[PDB]
Design a protein around this ligand. Structure first.
Ligand code: MG
Ligand code: MG
Ligand code: MG
Ligand code: MG
Ligand code: MG
Ligand code: MG
Ligand code: MG
Ligand code: MG
Ligand code: MG
Ligand code: MG
Ligand code: MG
Ligand code: MG
Ligand code: MG
Lengths: 115, 65, 151
RNA sequence: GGCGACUCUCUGGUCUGUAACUGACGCUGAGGAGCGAAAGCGUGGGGAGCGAACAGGAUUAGAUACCCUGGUAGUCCACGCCGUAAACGAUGAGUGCUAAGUGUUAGGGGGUUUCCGCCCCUUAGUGCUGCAGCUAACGCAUUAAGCACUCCGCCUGGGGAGUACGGUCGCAAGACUGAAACUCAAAGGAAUUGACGGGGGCCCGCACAAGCGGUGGAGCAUGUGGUUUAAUUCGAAGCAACGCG
């Protein structure tokens, strides 16, 4: 029953993560995009981000979690709503991380969709 | 804007001169543009080289926060 | 219309209960411009309410509206190649409209022979938090809350 | 053509300034020789990511496509080959001459100034605007599509055809060179006015939405089609013919 923990913001066009883990990155409860029986486009809404974040928060409160250190890693779709949901309990976002390649074209990305 | 290197009369930028190079990087570690710093084109080249040599030997960071 | 909002025409309150809210109902119930028939049914239906309960008919009727009148409704919205029934806050004006419409519609679908009884009985059902017009208000809310995602 | 982490090794050119030296030693350049994106080819490596082909899932009338999930060659390296691209500035090289204005890259000189800095001038790039002139027009305009001279390459209506035959080159793919018969009276360039767009912007109308009542089902009236008839008189045909003349 651990006091402190982490969550991990990493946002794209329509993908975001924020799982509830311990200080050393051992998991406890998890939040990332959906998880909650939502499907399709509803899954990527800001609303559905809240309900995923609440459900992982209320999972971790039962493990005696009081505070959540969260990261920063660019803007995206439903990142702000996911934080608002977590501020039911209350917490901080101190760290700032990144998912970027130090080469433009480190690995070659997949081809542009013709739509 | 005014160039730090032209104004102060610096004609050579050491890679090892860390404290100077910390003025021309972000909190995260990224090299700052000429628009922000207002440095000259020639010095921005000399500076960049100095940054990149510094990063090789862990004087400055690649990425940090 | 394209030009803008339009002057909403007003109805007079009524020669017994003095109620705009209930003159509207005569007009919802009226068919072929026969206002007399709808007045007669209303007034007969309200007598029947007063006898069964004992309370003032107006009162039961306004209690009934509260249970029928919706707050959220979904709205059909084509986005791409699939529909998303989007929830919207019902305007105060429209609440009454949907209130009375559902009351009058589901009144007519009841199995009681006369309309005055059908109306009365349906008004009492809404006050009991059950019936058809209530079940309609329940079902509109269920859809609205099911699509709460959208805004 | 291309070249983008860092370091060292080897190595080519350019620019500025100075004019000590040389004293037309220059320009261009068919053929020749070399270099030459990507894809491709050979041998041997390597193979994360990406991904022709191929498979599966969708989509669809079909879908040997677009979208999704996989995925082989290939993409990478060495050596060799291939020699092509809208290899484009769709603009051959050299030289001179012909208003301005304003950025920017690397220099030089000179102002009052201790520099920094400002200002003036100037060389060589790299952009934008714009005179004269040029242009079918669009536009070009000291980085000319202006005014000139030198040399090279190339064009001669559209198809047939960059095909055939021959030849050279190539492991192959193919490259280069390159016709004719026959056929047409047009192909084209730029600009104009429209119309149109599953282009953009702004508007309107019972156009939709919001409602209320219908039609489409039944019987009947009526008009029309069709069929029938000796004849079923003629006319009306999406909207804008069909209780219409
Ligand atoms: Mg020749
Ligand atoms: Mg290649
Ligand atoms: Mg190979
Ligand atoms: Mg694919
Ligand atoms: Mg060619
Ligand atoms: Mg090119
Ligand atoms: Mg050409
Ligand atoms: Mg030459
Ligand atoms: Mg309508
Ligand atoms: Mg009919
Ligand atoms: Mg006829
Ligand atoms: Mg005719
Ligand atoms: Mg007509």
């Amino acid at each position: 029953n651990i006091e402190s923990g982490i969550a991990h913001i990493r946002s794209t066009f329509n993908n975001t993560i924020v799982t509830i883990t311990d200080t050393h990155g051992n998991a406890i409860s998890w939040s990332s995009a959906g998880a909650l029986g939502f499907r399709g486009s509803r899954k990527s809404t800001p609303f559905a981000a809240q309900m995923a974040a609440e459900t992982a928060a209320k999972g971790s409160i039962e493990h005696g979690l009081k505070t959540l250190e969260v990261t920063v890693k660019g803007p995206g779709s439903g990142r702000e709503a996911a934080i608002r949901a977590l501020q039911a309990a209350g917490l901080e976002v101190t760290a700032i991380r990144d998912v970027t390649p130090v080469p433009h074209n480190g690995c070659r990305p997949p081809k542009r969709r013709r739509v | 804007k005014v160039c730090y290197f032209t104004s102060n009369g610096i004609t050579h930028i050491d890679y090892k001169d860390v404290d100077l190079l910390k003025k021309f990087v972000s909190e995260r570690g990224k090299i700052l543009p000429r628009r922000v710093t207002g440095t000259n084109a020639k010095y921005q080249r000399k500076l960049t080289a100095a940054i990149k040599r510094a990063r090789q030997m862990a004087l400055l960071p690649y990425v940090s926060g | 219309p394209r030009k803008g909002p339009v002057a909403k025409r007003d109805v007079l309150p009524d020669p017994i209960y003095n109620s705009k809210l209930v003159s509207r109902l005569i007009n919802k119930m009226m068919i072929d411009g026969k206002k007399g028939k709808s007045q007669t049914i209303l007034y007969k239906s309200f007598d029947i309410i007063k006898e069964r309960t004992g309370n003032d008919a107006m009162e039961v009727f306004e209690q009934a509206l509260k249970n029928i009148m919706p707050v959220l409704e979904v709205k059909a919205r084509r986005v791409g190649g699939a529909n998303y029934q989007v929830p919207v806050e019902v305007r105060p004006e429209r609440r009454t409209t949907l209130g009375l419409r559902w009351l009058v519609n589901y009144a007519r679908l009841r199995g009681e022979k006369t309309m005055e009884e059908r109306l009365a009985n349906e008004i009492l059902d809404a006050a009991n938090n059950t019936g058809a017009a209530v079940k309609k208000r329940e079902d509109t809310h269920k859809m609205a809350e099911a699509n709460k995602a959208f805004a």
